[PDB]
Amino acid sequence: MKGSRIELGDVTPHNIKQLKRLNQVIFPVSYNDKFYKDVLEVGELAKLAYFNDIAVGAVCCRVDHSQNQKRLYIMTLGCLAPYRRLGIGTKMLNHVLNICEKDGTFDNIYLHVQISNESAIDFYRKFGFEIIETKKNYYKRIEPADAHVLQKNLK
Amino acid sequence: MNIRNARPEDLMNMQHCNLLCLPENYQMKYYFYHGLSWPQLSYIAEDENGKIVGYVLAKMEEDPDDVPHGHITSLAVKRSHRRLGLAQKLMDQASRAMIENFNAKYVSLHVRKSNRAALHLYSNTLNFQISEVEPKYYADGEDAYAMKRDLTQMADELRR
Amino acid sequence: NLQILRDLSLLQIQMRDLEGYRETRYQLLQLRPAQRASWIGYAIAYHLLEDYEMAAKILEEFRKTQQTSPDKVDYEYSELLLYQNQVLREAGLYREALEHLCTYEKQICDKLAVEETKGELLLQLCRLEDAADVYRGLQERNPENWAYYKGLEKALKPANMLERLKIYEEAWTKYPRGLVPRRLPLNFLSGEKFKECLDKFLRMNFSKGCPPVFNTLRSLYKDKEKVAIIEELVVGYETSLKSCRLFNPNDDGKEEPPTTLLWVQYYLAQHYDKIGQPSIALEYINTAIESTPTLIELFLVKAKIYKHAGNIKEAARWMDEAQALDTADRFINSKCAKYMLKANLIKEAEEMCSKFTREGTSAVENLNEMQCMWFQTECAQAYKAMNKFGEALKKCHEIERHFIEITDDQFDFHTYCMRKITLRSYVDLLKLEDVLRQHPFYFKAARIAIEIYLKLHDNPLPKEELIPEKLAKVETPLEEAIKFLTPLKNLVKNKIETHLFAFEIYFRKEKFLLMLQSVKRAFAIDSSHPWLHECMIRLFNTAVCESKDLSDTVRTVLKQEMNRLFGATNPKNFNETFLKRNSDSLPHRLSAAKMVYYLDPSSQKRAIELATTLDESLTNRNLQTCMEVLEALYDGSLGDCKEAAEIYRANCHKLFPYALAFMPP
Ligand SMILES: CC(=O)SCCNC(=O)CCNC(=O)[C@H](O)C(C)(C)COP(=O)(O)OP(=O)(O)OC[C@H]1O[C@@H](n2cnc3c(N)ncnc32)[C@H](O)[C@@H]1OP(=O)(O)O
Ligand SMILES: CC(=O)SCCNC(=O)CCNC(=O)[C@H](O)C(C)(C)COP(=O)(O)OP(=O)(O)OC[C@H]1O[C@@H](n2cnc3c(N)ncnc32)[C@H](O)[C@@H]1OP(=O)(O)O
Ligand SMILES: O=P(O)(O)O[C@H]1[C@H](OP(=O)(O)O)[C@H](OP(=O)(O)O)[C@H](OP(=O)(O)O)[C@@H](OP(=O)(O)O)[C@H]1OP(=O)(O)O
């Protein structure tokens, strides 16, 4: 805990272009402008992750209402390729979980993972995520078009 | 960089560094007011060629219903000279000049709620405390943080 | 009769009649001798007349009637002693000023001004043992001031390079956060002692993550020995940092974050830009951008490489890229508009400054009200580059109108600084308002105005508003140019451009006694100036073949001081003497070639081969001179040479592969 050079920050209208530049560098899929308009209206579920005071990663979430239960869908979570294996994704994902036990009304945590990114499954598996559903034809143009559904039960 | 006490010949270059990076600008006769009322409180930073790269404009708030306290009017560093230690070293020279010239008990300022660079300076390094959130204090409707830094632990190390 | 003598002195200190001001404050003293404003107004009237040995005896008879007063303030009395100590130092009385300081040093609140004058007085009295214990106490208060290390070197007086370093080496262990004591040894060390002292400077700043590690070390780049030490050190850092995550492959510490390799590539992108190799400067900065694409400092440097290489339209593209990332920093917004104005994009730059201004007005109208002189200079320069000479004269007249505001802004401080005793800063304000227009923002605005009025004489085409079309259609362009020159001729005399701009105004008015006066002052500053040579060749030529239409008392006195300035020759052998003394400097070679065509237009082919020299033995063969040689082959200063101005453009394109001035059509 002592000596932290990793910290999080709020997505602001004055740094929203950094959030879009982080997304298109890291993820193969693209997001329209209406995605980046809703992310300014969420609050503390959208965080920019910093490392030595430069922005190297981000997390975006939204509140879901499906299957008669309150879920939280973690859409984007990742950091840059030169800055991995350094603890950025552990700090980002613990921030999402800290909101969940503080509220207590949440029922689920889920996200879709590509079946080719086997490094990302082994990161989420450590925090309690299970493979509950295998989608097919989820992504359109990418070479792996399948997608697992990784879920975490809070109750 | 040379950190030294600002003279009236340096005031016209401090307005140029203010117009260059801060959205809350002042006239020239405001600078000639801070340099003739509290000359010892305004400091600057400069390089080998003599151009100003940072400044601190500070004052003492003249109010009779309370203890004497300092006020930070402005602070900026050119982006070519940021992350050099230049602004903590400019606020440390100005807070010491409030203690030994006017016997200030604390120092206050206003900072925007989204100014992340200045929040990490005042809270994590200069140890300012958030006193009052002021709503719609600025021209684009943004809320400000009123901050306070107690100048009594710093006054004990000068007498020691 | 008060308030008729009070405001009369108030407008006398404004217009600076110090003999009529001293006679007015003398009557106020004999009418109101009890007020503290009547004594300190009478002593300032002697400090401005440089009569220090009577101003020191009015501050003494005022001081002894002040400490006994029951309404004494501790701050208004310490500022009187610190001003009385200053009159004693300007009179040369360095002995009885230290005696005056050591008596009252416990009644003065400002301990910075007490220690700095005491450290100065103990040097002029040769008391260097007690002086070095003042400068060590000043250095503990502020270890970032350069004046406290030059006072230590003047008191300890080191002999060799080894014990001179011990002044700065003590300050490293005593102040581990100071940056000044670790940077000033690099100015005088040399060889292996320089290398191992620079090595502990660069590892400290790369691991910390300071972006201005280059902007500190930029002053010691004019040396060919010291550059090759930095060039081998950081390239050795960059090689091992992407192979073992360490600065050296042999030292035993913990490994480095990926941030450290990012900041060594950031140094070697500005390093090769300073050397003049923009192909490698762009190659390093693009590798850094492909790691962290949201770091704003990587786009301010890529836009600085293209500006130095000659592509200001490509440089303004990346300043527009960097402001998109963070839209609250006014620095990357104000420098982006500065790069838009350099690319002649005035309307694109006005919508840029509209992002950070008032809602209820325009973007350029707000910056005129906020005294923004850096924006009204680049707009005045860009309108001149687009041949909008009327619009450019509007901005140069608004900068001059800013300087009329500031000299009238001192009017509410003559009464204010006598009610509050702050007499040291008030006298420094009065001396500033005499030399206010020697600021650099006035010279770069008066240069544009005179150069436009010189073109309007060669080729003619509340308060009151300024209309751009009324300004350029003026009947006396050289009489409006002399109003921009009259303050420069008084206050800015150390610059050679002040006297040479005085030549061009009087050369077009045929006033030979003033053309001789201005060329004599410019000769005593830099006699090997290329622009000065084009003035005296044009002076000697209009005294040989233009000897009939002058007065007899004028033509007799002229020829005496010419032969004092150059030997018993014609103007043609003065050009060959100038050409042979400095033939390896390219700007002098163009100034000699433009005059060997001016004296006789039949020698055109020798004039072209002089100016189009491009071998590597030349000095100042950079972009800014080769662009000036090429534009002289277009403007007719070397004759009709359209065939020769195209083989030169294709030769200069191999030297500068990024510039837009040498791009092929
Ligand atoms: C299907 C889809 O496309 S879903 C989109 C998922 N997001 C992305 O793909 C973007 C980035 N992808 C990644 O996989 C990133 O590496 C992320 C998300 C793991 C970033 O998190 P990181 O910064 O790497 O956290 P970090 O690795 O430091 O800590 C997590 C711990 O889990 C372990 N771990 C993490 N990755 C791995 C891995 N490939 N293999 C084995 N163990 C791992 C480590 O033990 C690590 O501990 P450590 O820091 O002491 O080494
Ligand atoms: C006017 C007022 O009273 S408040 C408004 C002040 N700001 C403005 O007007 C806009 C211009 N902003 C600036 O010029 C600068 O960013 C300033 C004044 C905020 C400070 O910048 P610097 O000159 O780099 O200050 P400095 O390096 O001494 O700050 C030290 C600490 O401040 C923090 N800090 C400084 N800059 C940053 C930054 N960009 N991001 C995050 N933290 C920062 C850090 O915690 C740093 O600690 P460290 O030295 O251990 O790394
Ligand atoms: O913005 P200013 O305070 O007026 O200083 C600028 C600026 O220097 P800074 O970046 O430190 O502020 C220029 O840098 P850029 O405009 O290229 O970003 C620099 O130019 P160089 O670093 O390339 O040398 C120099 O310009 P100049 O070379 O003319 O001195 C100077 O400009 P002025 O002092 O003349 O205004």
Numbering used by the authors:
A (entry chain A): 1 to 155
B (entry chain C): 1 to 160
C (entry chain B): 113 to 573, 638 to 841
Question: Which sentences from the paper describe this structure?
Answer:
NatA forms complexes with at least two other proteins, NAA50 and the chaperone protein Huntingtin-interacting protein K (HYPK). The trimeric hNAA10/hNAA15/hNAA50 complex is referred to as hNatE, and we refer to the tetrameric hNAA10/hNAA15/hNAA50/HYPK complex as hNatE/HYPK. NatA acetylates non-methionine containing substrates harboring small N-terminal residues (alanine, serine, threonine, cysteine, and valine). Taken together, these studies reveal the molecular basis for coordinated N-terminal acetylation by the hNAA10 and hNAA50 catalytic subunits of NatE and its modulation by HYPK.
To determine the molecular basis for interaction and enzymatic crosstalk between human NAA10 and NAA50 enzyme subunits within the NatE complex, we determined the single-particle cryogenic electron microscopy (cryo-EM) structure of the hNatE complex in the presence of inositol hexakisphosphate IP6 and bi-substrate analogs of both hNatA and hNAA50. After refinement of the model, we observed clear density of IP6 and acetyl-CoA cofactors in each catalytic subunit, but the peptide portion of the bi-substrate inhibitors was not resolved. The structure was refined to an overall resolution of 3.0 Å, with most residues of hNAA10 and hNAA50 subunits resolved to 2.5 Å. Indeed, we find that hNAA15-Thr406 is located at the center of the hNAA50-hNAA15 interface, making hydrogen bond interactions with the backbone carbonyl group of hNAA50-Ala55. Additional hydrogen bonds are formed between the backbone carbonyl of hNAA50-His14 with the backbone amide of hNAA15-Thr439, between hNAA50-Arg21 and the backbone carbonyl of hNAA15-Pro405, and between hNAA50-Asn52 and hNAA15-Thr371. hNAA50-Arg21 also makes direct ionic interaction with hNAA15-Glu433, which is absent in yeast. Interactions are observed between hNAA50-Glu7 and hNAA10-Arg116, and between hNAA50-Asp53 and hNAA10-Arg83. The hNAA10 β6–β7 loop displayed about a 4 Å shift toward hNAA50 in the hNatE complex relative to the hNatA complex. Given that the β6–β7 loop of hNAA10 plays an important role in peptide substrate recognition, we propose that this shift in position also contributes to the inhibitory effect that hNAA50 binding has on hNatA activity. Notably, the β6–β7 and α1–α2 peptide substrate-binding loops of hNAA50 within the hNatE complex superimposed well with hNAA50 bound to CoA and substrate peptide.
